[PDB]
Amino acid sequence: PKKVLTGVVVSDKMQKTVTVLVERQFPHPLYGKVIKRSKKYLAHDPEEKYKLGDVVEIIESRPISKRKRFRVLRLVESGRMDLVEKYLIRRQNYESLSKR
Amino acid sequence: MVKIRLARFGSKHNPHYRIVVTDARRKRDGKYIEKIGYYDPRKTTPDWLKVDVERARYWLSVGAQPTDTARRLLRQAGVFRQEA
Amino acid sequence: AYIPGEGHNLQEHSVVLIRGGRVKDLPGVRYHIVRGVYDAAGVKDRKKSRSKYGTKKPKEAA
Amino acid sequence: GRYIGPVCRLCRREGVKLYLKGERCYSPKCAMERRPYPPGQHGQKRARRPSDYAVRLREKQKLRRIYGISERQFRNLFEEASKKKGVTGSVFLGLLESRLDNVVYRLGFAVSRRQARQLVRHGHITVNGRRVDLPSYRVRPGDEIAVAEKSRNLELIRQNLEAMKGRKVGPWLSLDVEGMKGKFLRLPDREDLALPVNEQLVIEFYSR
Amino acid sequence: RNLSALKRHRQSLKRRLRNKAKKSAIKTLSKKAIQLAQEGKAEEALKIMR
RNA sequence: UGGAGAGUUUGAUCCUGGCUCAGGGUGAACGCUGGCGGCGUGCCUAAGACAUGCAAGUCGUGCGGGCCGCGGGGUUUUACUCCGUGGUCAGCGGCGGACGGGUGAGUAACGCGUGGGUGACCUACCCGGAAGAGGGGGACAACCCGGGGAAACUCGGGCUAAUCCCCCAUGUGGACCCGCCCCUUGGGGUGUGUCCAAAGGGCUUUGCCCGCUUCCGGAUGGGCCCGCGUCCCAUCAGCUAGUUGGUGGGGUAAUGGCCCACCAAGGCGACGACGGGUAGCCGGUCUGAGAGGAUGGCCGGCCACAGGGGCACUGAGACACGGGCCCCACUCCUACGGGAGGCAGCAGUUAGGAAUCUUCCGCAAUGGGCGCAAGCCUGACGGAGCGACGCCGCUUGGAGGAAGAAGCCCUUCGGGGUGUAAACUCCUGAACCCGGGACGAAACCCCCGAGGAGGGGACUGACGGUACCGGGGUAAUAGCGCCGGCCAACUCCGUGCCAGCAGCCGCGGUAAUACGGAGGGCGCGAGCGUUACCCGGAUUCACUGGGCGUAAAGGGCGUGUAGGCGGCCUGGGGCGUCCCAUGUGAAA
């Protein structure tokens, strides 16, 4: 049983490798309300036959690179970049608060 | 290698053992993978004959070994026995 | 560090064992003394708290 | 231990007399009738009022008194009774009398508590065949508190026997004065073999 | 003072004497392999392989 | 089926509100006390230092023997040559030293708890399996001779064999470059060119026993990825230069930039990266009413460290506690050139602290290393001992016995009281000795069948003449705390804001139930108090369970970013959800 998860492909900016950003569910132990958080698994694309936006399925494997675990199976869908949009927007807003 | 022994658990002076199988490394008091009975040589009550013969003959067919009074117990219950 | 009550014994040292209890003054008070150890030992005239006011057993004896 | 000494001097302490020192504590005085009220210079002033917690406490202490025991084993076995999944207090009452000292007392073979305990301690009693010494011994429905063979050949034991022949047993513990013995059965209660107390008061102060 | 630590270090020596002797010999023979294979000749490089 | 609170602010009142005590628990410590018994437990402080005893030994069914010594075989005998040889020593070799064992320095980390991955793998001691086991010889130990050395021991030539060590053969087979079929990230089968074996010893004897050689699978140990959860300070806010990524190598039992070259810039981060602190994690453990706060010793596991760092070599496997290299630091030994020693493995010494144990017994039981077996090792283990350190069992006694002795405390002197208490009586038999006495111990082995079953002869007890059975058996330790309110127990001289009490309000500013004592009394009893520490309480960090109009507290208002909550119907996915089925949730 090798565990997989439905993740949103990001960063084509690498050679033969894409980095998938995923968001998983869980309520709360002793409070309630469900939650959805950042976890970006490493998407192994042999000839960059995948890129930005295009959501796919990701697959846990053996260590292929420096921390790079996981891999990639079947593609899900294109016409995207919306989730990606939200993501990097959040990124800039990260780099919008300072102690200087 | 996996062996079989007798695991006393009683008080300071309560010779009441649980007949136990597990491997050599582990202590006489730790985690028993298996087990399969109990023994009381002191005889406070004739409950002291407890062996699980099925898994016994099996677990000896795979590659376990007895010990001293375990050789004894095994010859008792009918695990060494064969009635030709 | 204070003690139980009236009637001291020490000159210095004593190994007085810091205990621990504020009372209605000495902004802190705290950390009273064994009374027994290497000094103190209750006093010489108490008929009760010998469980820390020293004196083993008064024992009328005669 | 078990107080011992000015015993039923503490019978006026309760303000109430009891089958405690046996003879000199039933007939015309438990050190009573002579004078019944809490001992010491202060006894018959004009008393005040004990708070709920206090009176309920009192009741508990009275319980440990009639049975004559440190509240050690007592309290422990009380929570042990709370462990048994039945109505805690009452179940506790049955399993409370069940201790063989005052059991053998109200079974006959003893005049006083001190007696019963002293005797069983000396190996004078054997339940269901085995001669022991333990008085703090609870017994299951169907035992046989037989007496020792030399203890039948003793005297004050016979005195206790004949100074009884005319008393209905606690409807379960049959008296065999045929060879000195007692047959043990069932489980009574605060309605079957009662006593002048309120149990759930004690229970209510007990655990707060 | 003593203990059979003597034994084990002695014999560890021995088996390492042989070990490293043959080990280094074989390293050097592997150099032989790369030169002869790189050249484009077999037969004797094939002997190397034997 | 599982739960109670009060005190304290004001003249008085209710609410808000914090601090305090009622409770359980703990490695405890001390002060008062102290007796037998059981089962447990019993340095947390300097991971300071550690003297002396055990921890790791074993095999002669692998081999060459040196020696004490024996029958002294041979020697008609000499001196002694050597066949048996009992006892010893080490040497080669094989097996464990990688288990048993300790303890928190390191560490917030896939380390742990945990449900899975390996088509990315290794595992001797047991099993089922297939082919078998020949040929040559080489080297050094030991030993033979000789040198130095206080010692550590160190040196040069000669001998000798062997489950020591290689070279050719044997190939069912393994494994490899190239090929293919199914399987789909190097999993299976199979061809063409290649390599390797093995080693044999001992008897009861031509048959047998231990071991081997190849090869796979099975049992285990474990390795390495992952899904989740996993401690305080954001006054720790940005951060990274093997750093993100590749090809191609090297590396390891195995994938990965873990090491290397080139080339290309990302990489993670407010949901908490970078870092300081802090701690080893878990089953659990005390409380709690429940959810939770806390923490993690004995007992069970995992992680890691052997003074301190780097280290390889070795073996199946370790960077190895009782191994060595280097280094630094550190004690001790010496004939002064030079040498060695290391217990955060079990007892003990010192300092540290208020504080925490014998430098004893047995291998008998179990149990761990080797051996054909007996057996030798055996601080794993089984116990005595000690301290009330805790709980459970408990004795110090039972019986009658006054209108109430006396001693004493009080008083309006009437007595109340102490106190049936005692005294006196009848009573049993603690402790103590005498007779006996365990279990724990039937194996293993031997004889029998075959060495397989079964039966039968049998070593085998430290604990300790102890739990206990019988006899004789004698009345024989009681102490601590409170007595103003929370609290149940008050009468009497003394004390005069002085001497003291003190968890919180307060008590003595000479009529003190709160301070001393006396009496009686209340709680308890080998226990009683006092202090340190977590929590229920405390709904007082408010999830069941909070507040912000004046009691802590609404942003200076606008504003919109991430984020969260989404009006009415139809269907679609069915991630979250729900029930049902199953693996686990170990043991204790």
Swiss-Prot record, chain A:
InterPro entries: NA-bd_OB-fold, Ribosomal_uS17, Ribosomal_uS17_bact/chlr, Ribosomal_uS17_CS. The keyword rRNA-binding applies. Gene3D superfamilies: Nucleic acid-binding proteins (2.40.50.140). GO terms for biological process: translation. Keywords: Ribonucleoprotein, Ribosomal protein, RNA-binding, rRNA-binding. CDD domains: Ribosomal_uS17. It comes from the Bacteria. Coiled coil: none annotated. GO terms for molecular function: rRNA binding; structural constituent of ribosome. Disulfide bonds: none annotated. One of its GO terms (cellular component) is cytosolic small ribosomal subunit. Disruption phenotype: Increased generation time and a temperature-sensitive phenotype. Part of the 30S ribosomal subunit. Contacts protein S12. HAMAP family: Ribosomal_uS17_B. Belongs to the universal ribosomal protein uS17 family. One of the primary rRNA binding proteins, it binds directly to 16S rRNA where it helps nucleate assembly of the platform and body of the 30S subunit by bringing together and stabilizing interactions between several different RNA helices. The combined cluster of proteins S8, S12 and S17 appears to hold together the shoulder and platform of the 30S subunit. This is Small ribosomal subunit protein uS17.
From Swiss-Prot, chain B:
Gene3D superfamilies: 3.30.1320.10. Pfam families: Ribosomal_S16. GO terms for biological process: translation. PANTHER family: 30S RIBOSOMAL PROTEIN S16, SMALL RIBOSOMAL SUBUNIT PROTEIN BS16M. Part of the 30S ribosomal subunit. Binds to the lower part of the body of the 30S subunit, where it stabilizes two of its domains. Belongs to the bacterial ribosomal protein bS16 family. This is Small ribosomal subunit protein bS16.
From Swiss-Prot, chain C:
It comes from the Bacteria. Residues 45-56 have a biased composition (Basic residues). Residues 42-62 are annotated as: Disordered. GO terms for biological process: translation. GO terms for molecular function: rRNA binding; structural constituent of ribosome; tRNA binding. Belongs to the universal ribosomal protein uS12 family. Part of the 30S ribosomal subunit. Contacts proteins S8 and S17. May interact with IF1 in the 30S initiation complex. This is Small ribosomal subunit protein uS12. It comes from Thermus thermophilus (strain ATCC BAA-163 / DSM 7039 / HB27). The gene is rpsL.
From Swiss-Prot, chain D:
InterPro entries: Ribosomal_uS4, Ribosomal_uS4_bac-type, Ribosomal_uS4_CS, Ribosomal_uS4_N, S4_RNA-bd, S4_RNA-bd_sf. It comes from Thermus thermophilus (strain ATCC BAA-163 / DSM 7039 / HB27). Keywords: Metal-binding, Ribonucleoprotein, Ribosomal protein, RNA-binding, rRNA-binding, Zinc, Zinc-finger. This is Small ribosomal subunit protein uS4. The gene is rpsD. Pfam families: Ribosomal_S4, S4. Belongs to the universal ribosomal protein uS4 family. Binds 1 zinc ion per subunit. One of the primary rRNA binding proteins, it binds directly to 16S rRNA where it helps nucleate assembly of the body and platform of the 30S subunit.
